[PDB]
Amino acid sequence: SGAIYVGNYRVVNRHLATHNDWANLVWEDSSRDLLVSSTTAQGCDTIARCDCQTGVYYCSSRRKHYPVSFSKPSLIFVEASEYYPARYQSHLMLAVGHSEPGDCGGILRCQHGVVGIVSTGGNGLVGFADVRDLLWLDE
Ligand SMILES: CS(=O)(=O)c1ccc(Br)cc1CC(=O)N1CCC[C@H](C(N)=O)C1
Ligand SMILES: [Zn+2]
């Protein structure tokens, strides 16, 4: 579980969004597994605007942060689940690192700020849904 709080926005995995998130919906994209809802309180997370391919992510199944090299956002095939049929997830980045069900929502950060959140994984890999192209989160 986990979310990004920037300005008047909350960014969470779309498959884990709550009733409040859907009642206060700003934007959602099932192909990216992302949903953004509005908040009354102000958020101070900084979003990175870069093309970093290294960073650090939070892994809740280990209560630890790990450094990773990750790929550029692209379309990657993702297996069926209680949340989605089999499909290509877009804007997804892969890294070699530990992740297991329950880890979605962990933040990936580089020196510039928040890069994305855990969205997929398994087999010694971890997948992150990128948020660096959503320029409107800041303004
Ligand atoms: C594939 S797994 O070994 O069950 C796993 C491992 C790590 C992590 Br983080 C998570 C899982 C499950 C997984 O990737 N899901 C379920 C939730 C929605 C995801 C999606 N973006 O379509 C796909
Ligand atoms: Zn960066």
Swiss-Prot record:
It catalyses: Selective cleavage of Tyr-|-Gly bond in the picornavirus polyprotein. Homodimer. Cysteine protease that cleaves viral polyprotein and specific host proteins. It is responsible for the autocatalytic cleavage between the P1 and P2 regions, which is the first cleavage occurring in the polyprotein. Also cleaves the host translation initiation factor EIF4G1, in order to shut down the capped cellular mRNA translation. Inhibits the host nucleus-cytoplasm protein and RNA trafficking by cleaving host members of the nuclear pores. Counteracts stress granule formation probably by antagonizing its assembly or promoting its dissassembly. It comes from Coxsackievirus A16 (strain G-10). Zn(2+) 1 binds at C50, C52, C110, H112. This is Protease 2A. Coiled coil: none annotated. The active site is at H15, D33, C104.
